[PDB]
Enzyme design. Sequence first.
Site, short mmCIF file in Angstrom:
data_model
loop_
_atom_site.label_atom_id
_atom_site.label_comp_id
_atom_site.label_asym_id
_atom_site.label_seq_id
_atom_site.Cartn_x
_atom_site.Cartn_y
_atom_site.Cartn_z
N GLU A 1 9.83 -4.01 -6.48
CA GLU A 1 8.59 -3.87 -5.67
C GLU A 1 8.06 -5.29 -5.62
O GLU A 1 7.80 -5.79 -4.52
CB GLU A 1 7.66 -2.81 -6.19
N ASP B 1 0.44 -3.03 10.45
CA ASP B 1 -0.90 -2.66 10.92
C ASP B 1 -2.01 -2.88 9.92
O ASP B 1 -2.56 -1.90 9.38
CB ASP B 1 -0.86 -1.22 11.43
N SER C 1 -2.16 -3.52 7.05
CA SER C 1 -1.79 -2.71 5.89
C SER C 1 -1.36 -3.67 4.80
O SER C 1 -0.79 -4.71 5.14
CB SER C 1 -0.66 -1.76 6.24
N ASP D 1 -0.05 -3.94 0.46
CA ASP D 1 0.47 -3.39 -0.79
C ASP D 1 0.14 -4.44 -1.84
O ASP D 1 0.59 -5.56 -1.54
CB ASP D 1 1.98 -3.19 -0.70
N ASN E 1 -0.32 0.75 -1.65
CA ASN E 1 -0.79 0.38 -0.31
C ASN E 1 -2.17 0.94 0.05
O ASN E 1 -2.44 2.12 -0.08
CB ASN E 1 0.26 0.79 0.71
#
Length: 129
Positions: free
Chosen positions: A35, A48, A50, A52, A59
């Site tokens: 990750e 978008d 967005s 994390d 997220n």
Amino acid sequence: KVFGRCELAAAMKRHGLDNYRGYSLGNWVCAAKFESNFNTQATNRNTDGSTDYGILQINSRWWCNDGRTPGSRNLCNIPCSALLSSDITASVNCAKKIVSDGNGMNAWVAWRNRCKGTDVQAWIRGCRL
């Protein structure tokens, strides 16, 4: 900070990640490396507006708020910056609410693609345990 396979093992373990919802410790450390290599400050911008953040890349459109998204629910009901401090207690705390709805750890796209089906419980071994 940046963690060390082992160093992060025992931390997750003190925070009740060993076995939780039938996922052994091992599972946890492994989703970690694919990750963000075990990098806490690590954020990543998707398409978008967005994002994390940290150790496990929780997220923002779903779990936390970073003031900005047309969707933005805060299911984990916290502030995304809680997620970028070496104090891992907001990531683990949130993970367990993630794990708890449907898809288990199959919700961490890199756990179902890199550790599902493997010998997970090895990730944990040698770290003094």
